[PDB]
Amino acid sequence: FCLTLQNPLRKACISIVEWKPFETIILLTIFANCVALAVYLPMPEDDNNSLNLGLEKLEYFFLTVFSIEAAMKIIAYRSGWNVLDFIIVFLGVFTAILVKALRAFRVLRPLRLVSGVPSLQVVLNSIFKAMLPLFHIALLVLFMVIIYAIIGLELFKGKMHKTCYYIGTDIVATVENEKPSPCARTGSGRPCTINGSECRGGWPGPNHGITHFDNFGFSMLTVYQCITMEGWTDVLYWVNDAIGNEWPWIYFVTLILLGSFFILNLVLGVLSGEFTKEREKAKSRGTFQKLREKQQLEEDLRGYMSWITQGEVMWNRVFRWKCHDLVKSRVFYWLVILIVALNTLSIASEHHNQPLWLTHLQDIANRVLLSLFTIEMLLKMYGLGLRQYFMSIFNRFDCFVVCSGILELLLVESGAMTPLGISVLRCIRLLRLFKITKYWTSLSNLVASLLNSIRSIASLLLLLFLFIIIFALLGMQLFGGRYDFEDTEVRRSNFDNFPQALISVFQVLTGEDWNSVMYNGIMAYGGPSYPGVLVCIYFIILFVCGNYILLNVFLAIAVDNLAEAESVRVLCHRIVNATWFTNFILLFILLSSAALAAEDPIRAESVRNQILGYFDIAFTSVFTVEIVLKMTTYRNYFNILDLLVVAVSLISMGLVVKILRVLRVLRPLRAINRAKGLKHVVQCVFVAIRTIGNIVLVTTLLQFMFACIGVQLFKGKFFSCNDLSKMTEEECRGYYYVYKDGDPTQMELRPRQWIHNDFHFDNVLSAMMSLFTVSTFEGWPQLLYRAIDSNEEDMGPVYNNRVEMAIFFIIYIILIAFFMMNIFVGFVIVTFQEQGETEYKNCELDKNQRQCVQYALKARPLRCYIPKNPYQYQVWYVVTSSYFEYLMFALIMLNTICLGMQHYHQSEEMNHISDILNVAFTIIFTLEMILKLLAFKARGYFGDPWNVFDFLIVIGSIIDVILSEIDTFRISSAFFRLFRVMRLIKLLSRAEGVRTLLWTFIKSFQALPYVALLIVMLFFIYAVIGMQMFGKIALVDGTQINRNNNFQTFPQAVLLLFRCATGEAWQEILLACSYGKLCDPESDYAPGEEYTCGTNFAYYYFISFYMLCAFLIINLFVAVIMDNFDYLT
């Protein structure tokens, strides 16, 4: 379609348009735009500084140079990446004609920086090729949300709108941290005991209006957030506060357990498509045989040349043999460790106060232990060879240590050094911790594993950083200091800066607390409305695409980490083997732990005790009786535990009291060794630990190395005074004013004291605590934003002091994200070896060539249940056709949108229509099962399960129509409505590509549910251990152990642990169990002891639950590789 095809002097432009460095001039001018949009400081209500005002005019430079370029590209002469090139320019020419809509399109310009620089043309081409096999997984999650949006829409419409306002006022009544949570005047939810308040209609609501369940778009928004396991417990505890509990738990803990399971097989989805490409290059086994010869040739040639080297430079030789016999001996394998282990205790002492003698020992030790460092080095200088010493990289590292120790000691004696710098010199020593790593035997294998992986990621990782810039430059244009709000609470992750928008994007990227962030962008524009809640779309694409890039660094490692993997006693004898005795025990275990489940557990006097004390001591009798009959018959790990739990339950009869009660919980563990499925799963995982152990031993060194740099840099900070205006020790005392809401006419008078921020960096032990929770991506923002606000030693926080200390929490967070991902790849690559170990017995063509033989050898013909009777045959001639096929598929889609609308405060004319609709859609669907049953002749109609599932829906609909209209002559009909929803599951019936993926998982449910048995056991033991211990815990609301989040009963303690298993702010629950909590005035405690029911076992408990939940959920990750392996390969 060329344009006039002319040859003036314009042909000489083509020699200049495409010369050589025309890329380089355009690379250097788009990079200026990146800086021109980074210094754009946004201003709230039409304001412009000076630099902001000069950069508006600088756009006209980048308007014309991108136009001088592009018009020459027209004079010069298909690339889709150039097709966006004129697209970016053609909006800004419209911007010269013209208000803030085109302001946001200049954010798109660095995408031109992609199209300029090649190699990132490799990445974006490769990233869309992963998206083809993922399509069925993503489309089922799209059906997963729509089912749980319609079910949460019809079950919870309008249920949140109750309030707990004051007496008659407009103020919503809270307590000091308590979120404004709904009420109900009728039963089962919130008596509203906040003393001078009465529940009235109107609006208390969830977050500000944004976490409803009415109007299809809000339901679908708040089952989205719930799916990402972030903030799913507020949407639980709000429903559970308005309806009443005991029913709506089953809604969310099946949304989590299905939302987990179908993202757990999305991560295994992408790792299918690129591995089968890589199995086709594993047949170059004769080329690694050439490779390991060459690295054997490089091994000898350096070694023999040192044989040459240390013969040339050879009285003074008499000192030499001394420096062989002292150096290479057993002595310096043990003389150095006493120094090094004595150094890493010197550098990790580090208190806040260190009374006076410790800080004198810190300086002499450093002075002493350097005198051993230099000598140790200097003995290698003479008796090893000079050229041999510096060639080794690990001893080149030891050069940089010993020099820097001398430089930092003498610079202090010089005296001319800033107090900013002596802290820097102190952090330089910390690099001595790698001296320990002269150990690890596969260290040189390990670094070659990791550094080979990064150069497979350095293409993709530069795409991730240029992804988080576009969304940071975009969010600064949409939100841009619209966080004004006329309020006093700290909306701290604002975007009104370039670094604050670079923290805040990276916070919603890692998943932590993107809920509170999205609730501010929605409330900045128009809070909740039509035009305004379409700013959800910014925090969706940032969280879906921003993770899909980051899921693609999970593959490029896994294809790189896979390339390396290619190269009378007869009477006692019967009893133990009786059916009477084994089936006795299994039934007796289940009755032993059913009482042990639900004790009181906090009454100590009531009727539920005297029953169980009789039910417990009588049960210890039988138990001990079993350990007699095993020992009269005859190493096993099951009998070492059988003799351990029985002896303690016997001594409870000698009883110290409640400890031996809880030693009876071990029982069912014995029944787990009587299960066989786990022998395959647990054994395969300890194969994988042996090869990943090397990585785990390094990633727990960094939490010690970044503890010691973390202590060093934040000692004594995070020490905040209660009213944020007093800044030091003595004067944060006395009483002050707490102004409510916003206005200075509601003064309340509280006292003030030092609050110590609970996860402080004081000790190296006490800093591994805090840096363990920012390792689990939970609670870092609150802590991170504190580390920004800190200043000098014992002083309160200054507001936005030193944002440069947000680089610590980023580099470390990114690093630990990279060592947590290299572990994960390890458990995958190991199991794909361990499954193929069964198919090493091959002598056959292929896997596809294996199944299709078993598809031919085993298969048989199909039913084909064709009828007689040409009256009936005409009826069947319709039913199996595409007439009914396309019609009954159609009327579900109209039945979808009939359920789709269903909003709140709908009109009465609309209530009359949808009541007819429901009646219309039942009569059609019951006319389906009439025609099919008169066609299929009962035999065949029950045959397929889909028709039997229709018979379940139809009757539940007919009994839903009848139950509604009998009422018109009634709250209980809320279950029968669910049957109206289940018609959407008839959709997937014809969707052949999706049904074949669910049916794979039901066929896979083989090696999974024995691993799920350990999950249930895990939740069962940690429920009962904490229930006796963390009861008496005084359900005061506002204090994070509250009426929704009890520890008291058994199913309230299961749900609390399901909160900590999906990471939902478990760091608070740990602080809720302590030493100074109240003791629930139903217990005894009768004088005085009113604030001593906390038991600090919680640090030993939630942490030991968290690793045993993390390790065992990895076994859920492994067990899904296990049976789906035929589908994933």
PDB file of C-alpha atoms in Angstrom, residues 210 215 218 478-479 482 518 521-539:
ATOM      1  CA  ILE A 210     -16.229  -1.352  49.221  1.00  0.00           C
ATOM      2  CA  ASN A 215     -24.495  -5.680  43.139  1.00  0.00           C
ATOM      3  CA  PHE A 218     -18.905  -5.912  44.496  1.00  0.00           C
ATOM      4  CA  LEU A 478      -3.943   8.543  38.800  1.00  0.00           C
ATOM      5  CA  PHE A 479      -3.529   8.898  42.565  1.00  0.00           C
ATOM      6  CA  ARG A 482      -5.329  12.701  45.735  1.00  0.00           C
ATOM      7  CA  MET A 518      -6.876  -0.593  46.900  1.00  0.00           C
ATOM      8  CA  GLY A 521      -7.474   4.398  45.399  1.00  0.00           C
ATOM      9  CA  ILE A 522     -11.169   3.605  45.327  1.00  0.00           C
ATOM     10  CA  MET A 523     -11.887   6.141  48.010  1.00  0.00           C
ATOM     11  CA  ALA A 524      -9.631   8.824  46.529  1.00  0.00           C
ATOM     12  CA  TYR A 525     -11.697   9.254  43.409  1.00  0.00           C
ATOM     13  CA  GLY A 526     -15.317   8.735  44.098  1.00  0.00           C
ATOM     14  CA  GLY A 527     -15.729   6.226  46.861  1.00  0.00           C
ATOM     15  CA  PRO A 528     -17.773   3.526  45.904  1.00  0.00           C
ATOM     16  CA  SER A 529     -19.657   4.597  42.795  1.00  0.00           C
ATOM     17  CA  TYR A 530     -19.932   3.871  39.089  1.00  0.00           C
ATOM     18  CA  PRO A 531     -17.041   5.765  37.550  1.00  0.00           C
ATOM     19  CA  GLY A 532     -14.895   5.475  40.670  1.00  0.00           C
ATOM     20  CA  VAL A 533     -14.619   1.746  41.418  1.00  0.00           C
ATOM     21  CA  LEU A 534     -13.141   1.224  37.971  1.00  0.00           C
ATOM     22  CA  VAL A 535      -9.855   2.039  39.712  1.00  0.00           C
ATOM     23  CA  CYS A 536     -10.007  -1.519  40.971  1.00  0.00           C
ATOM     24  CA  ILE A 537      -8.675  -2.264  37.483  1.00  0.00           C
ATOM     25  CA  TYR A 538      -5.350  -0.675  38.382  1.00  0.00           C
ATOM     26  CA  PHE A 539      -4.821  -2.977  41.359  1.00  0.00           C
TER      27      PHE A 539
END
